[PDB]
C-alpha cells in the first residue's frame, strides 16, 4: 500500500484481459474461420493466409490465461517466473513466431476479406448472418482481426507498471526483463508486419513489371537484365508526372525504393520501364533534389551525366515530401 494496490490491480487486468482476449480469438474461430472452412469459402490453402496460425495462437494465449490462473488460485508476490515462461527463451521465441505470422497478414486478410463480400453475396450474407450471433458483443470480423497486434501493443503498457511497482528486487527484475521481452516482440512483429506489407505489394508489382524494354537497349540497363525487386525496401511510391520536355509529359507511378529509384509507367495492369528521352531506372547512389522556380508543384532529381528529371507532384506538399524522402534514402548509402 499504495504500491501494492495497483500491482495487484494491473495484474488482475492482465489476467482478465488476457481472458477476453482469449475468449475473442475463439469467437473468431467458431464463427468464422471453422464456418468458413466448412462452407469451403476458399480453398484452405488461402484461409490459412488469411487467419495464419489461428488454432495455435489461441493456444499460445490459452496457455498463458492458464498459468496466470494457476498462479493466482495458489494464493500476489511473484508472477515474474510465469511472465518469463511465456515471453522468454523458447515458449518467449514460439509466442513471437506465432502472434507475428498472424499479425503480418492482417491487411491481407481484411482486403481478403473484403472482395469476397463485395464480390459474393453469399459470403456477404455469411458474414453479416455471423455478425449479428451475441458471441460477437458486437464486434465486426473487421474490427477482430486486429485485436491481436492491438493486445501485443498492450503488454509492455502492462508489464511496465507492474515492474515499476514491485517492491522486492530480484521479483522486479523479471518482471522488468518480461516487459523487455514484450517490447521486443512488439518490435519484432511491427517490422515482419512492413515486410510482409512491402512484400505482397512488391511481388504484386515485380509480376506486372513488363521488363522487355531493358532486354533491347545496347545502353550499358545491362545490369537490370532480369530486375529484381521483390527483395528490397519500399521506401515511398506515388503518381507524379514526368516532364521529359518541356513539350512532352510523361504518366507514371513512382517508387522509391532502398537503393533504387523507378519511374514506372502504367498500361493497362501492366506497368512498363522505358528508355524514353533518359533512362526509367536509377541507381539513388548519386541523387540529389531540387527546387524549382518556375513551378513549386515541381522539382529536379540529379545524377551525380546529368540527367536531369523533372518531376511534378499534384500539391507542393508532396514534392517537398518527395525530395525529403529521395535526399533521405539517397544519403543512407554507403561510398565504396
Same mark, same amino acid.
Given at each position: ?41 476458399? *480453398? ?10 489461428? #488454432? ?24 515474474? #517466473? ?106 519484432? /512483429? ?48 506515388? *503518381? ?39 533512362? *526509367? ?34 500539391? /507542393? ?17 554507403? /561510398?565504396?
Amino acid at each position: 500500500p499504495k504500491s501494492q494496490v495497483k500491482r495487484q490491480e494491473v495484474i488482475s487486468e492482465l489476467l482478465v484481459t488476457e481472458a477476453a482476449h482469449v475468449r475473442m480469438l475463439r469467437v473468431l474461430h467458431d464463427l468464422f474461420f471453422q464456418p468458413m472452412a466448412e462452407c469451403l469459402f476458399f *480453398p484452405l490453402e488461402e484461409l490459412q493466409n488469411i487467419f495464419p496460425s489461428l #488454432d495455435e495462437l489461441i493456444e499460445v494465449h490459452s496457455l498463458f490465461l492458464d498459468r496466470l490462473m494457476k498462479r493466482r488460485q495458489e494464493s500476489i508476490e511473484e508472477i515474474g #517466473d510465469v511472465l518469463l515462461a511465456r515471453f522468454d527463451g523458447a515458449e518467449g521465441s514460439w509466442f513471437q513466431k506465432i502472434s507475428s505470422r498472424f499479425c503480418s497478414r492482417q491487411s491481407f486478410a481484411l482486403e481478403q476479406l473484403k472482395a469476397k463480400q463485395r464480390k459474393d453475396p453469399r459470403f456477404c450474407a455469411f458474414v453479416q448472418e455471423a455478425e449479428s450471433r451475441p458471441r460477437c458483443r458486437r464486434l465486426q470480423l473487421k474490427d477482430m482481426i486486429p485485436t491481436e497486434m492491438q493486445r501485443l501493443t498492450k503488454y509492455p503498457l502492462l508489464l511496465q507498471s507492474i515492474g515499476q511497482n514491485t517492491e522486492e528486487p530480484t521479483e522486479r527484475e523479471k518482471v522488468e526483463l518480461a516487459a523487455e521481452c514484450c517490447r521486443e516482440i512488439l518490435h519484432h /512483429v511491427n517490422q515482419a508486419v512492413r515486410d510482409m506489407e512491402d512484400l505482397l505489394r512488391l511481388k504484386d508489382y515485380q509480376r506486372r513489371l513488363d521488363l522487355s524494354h531493358l532486354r533491347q537497349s545496347s545502353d550499358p540497363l545491362s545490369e537490370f537484365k532480369n530486375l529484381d525487386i521483390t527483395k528490397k525496401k519500399l521506401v515511398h511510391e506515388g *503518381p507524379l508526372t514526368w516532364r521529359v520536355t518541356k513539350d512532352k509529359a510523361v504518366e507514371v507511378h513512382v517508387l522509391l525504393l532502398d537503393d533504387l529509384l523507378l519511374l514506372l509507367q502504367r498500361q493497362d495492369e501492366r506497368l512498363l520501364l522505358k528508355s524514353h528521352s533518359l533512362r *526509367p531506372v536509377l541507381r539513388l547512389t548519386s541523387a540529389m533534389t531540387r527546387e524549382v522556380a518556375t513551378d513549386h508543384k515541381a522539382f529536379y532529381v540529379l545524377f551525380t551525366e546529368a540527367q536531369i528529371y523533372e518531376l511534378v507532384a499534384q500539391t /507542393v506538399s508532396e514534392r517537398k515530401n518527395w525530395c525529403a524522402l529521395i535526399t533521405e534514402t539517397a544519403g543512407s548509402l554507403k /561510398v565504396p
